[PDB]
Amino acid sequence: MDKIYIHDMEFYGYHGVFPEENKLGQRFKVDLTVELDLKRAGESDDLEHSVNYGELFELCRKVVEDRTYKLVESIAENIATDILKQYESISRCTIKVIKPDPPIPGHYRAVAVEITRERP
Amino acid sequence: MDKIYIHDMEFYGYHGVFPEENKLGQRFKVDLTVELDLKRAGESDDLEHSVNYGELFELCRKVVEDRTYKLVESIAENIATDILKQYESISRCTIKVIKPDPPIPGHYRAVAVEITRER
Amino acid sequence: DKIYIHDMEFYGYHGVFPEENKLGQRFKVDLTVELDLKRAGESDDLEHSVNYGELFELCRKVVEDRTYKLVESIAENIATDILKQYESISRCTIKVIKPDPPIPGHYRAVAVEITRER
Amino acid sequence: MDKIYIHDMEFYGYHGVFPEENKLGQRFKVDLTVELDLKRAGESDDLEHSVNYGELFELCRKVVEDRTYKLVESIAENIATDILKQYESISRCTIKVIKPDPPIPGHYRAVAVEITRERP
């Protein structure tokens, strides 16, 4: 379907399995993909009929900054839940939470989770 | 299908919901993807069997520069439509309209809208 | 399963407008050939998979050693010769990229991408 | 189907058909994706129902650095293979083994092989 994106959002967060992670913190990135209809929006030009990009960002920030989890799997899952719940026009969404600097000994760009949630 | 592409067209436009995005303006980017058959163009090596990539660029430039809308949706929608209407050789198209510097307090690369259209 | 060569850069003199044919410009090719790789991945054998080096060479040949009006015909003659010389290739996808075309404006690149198979 | 990614792991190894590639060595890069349900991980916040991203790194490194094959097809095959053996919770995977500086006389970014491997 049609799609709103927010590419490579960046937060500082305290999330992790290790208590050393909890204390120090690290970078956390999020990519978002949400699906709806944009034919109406595009034939109209009135934001009242699509989902507001600025609110979708804020939502993401609350989960990554205003709350702490052990797993990036819980960041992704919460984001997805608040999305579908708060926004009834969005059908599907793919959400990817990225830990560019995890505490692993080796050479790499990033580890990440990605889920894709839908209304039953 | 086979695909023609234009990658990362960059414009300056004055689009936006708030009046201040219309005053100041901002960068807008557009990725173009159009679906058609290029087997004929390939074995012929003759441009009339394909679509001119310049005319495509120009067509989008007109939408992003010569007009102004509240919504990127609306930019995506007019491009898809003006491609389909003007080009019958094209079955299907995908247009993505990127705002890289929207006024959101935060840290992000970009926001965007992608639509895929057909007759 | 899949084999890849990414961002092959060549200098060629392709194009519709006769000035492009004297000046020339950059041409990039993304190659993407499909098959099964279970055979080679257990045997550890270049017999049971495709030579990546030859695939580059074939692309080099079509982009550097001949000239066409269209990028679509670079793409075609590559995809046709891949399916000619390599039976075990189920399918292929060629994306030919013109990064510096003579369009007055600001973009990264224009491009064709075909997918061919027997 | 949900996914754990590991992007652009970098190793130095001595893989190659040519005996010269075998003596000198060169860079090798690996991308990993693995499919599994992460909905329970995302509610419980419990790593046991998911899979350690770190152990995944190590699995890949064993193959690239502790062993030496003639082909990159072999590298991705054993990786996929070893993933499927050890982790029942993982349904499928995709492995891209990249060779960024292969001995091809020309101009290019990288050559590579991607495979996808599932269980019965």
Ligand SMILES: Cn1cnc2c(O)nc(N)nc21
């Ligand atoms: C090892 N490790 C630490 N935190 C983790 C997380 O959120 N997910 C996974 N899969 N592994 C983790």
Ligand SMILES: Cn1cnc2c(O)nc(N)nc21
């Ligand atoms: C908040 N906001 C402002 N302009 C917008 C647009 O074009 N699309 C969406 N989804 N949100 C917008």
Ligand SMILES: Cn1cnc2c(O)nc(N)nc21
């Ligand atoms: C305008 N133009 C010049 N060369 C071209 C090509 O190969 N394809 C298309 N579609 N347009 C071209």
Ligand SMILES: Cn1cnc2c(O)nc(N)nc21
């Ligand atoms: C030509 N060539 C040299 N080494 C190679 C390797 O490891 N794989 C493939 N497919 N080709 C190679």
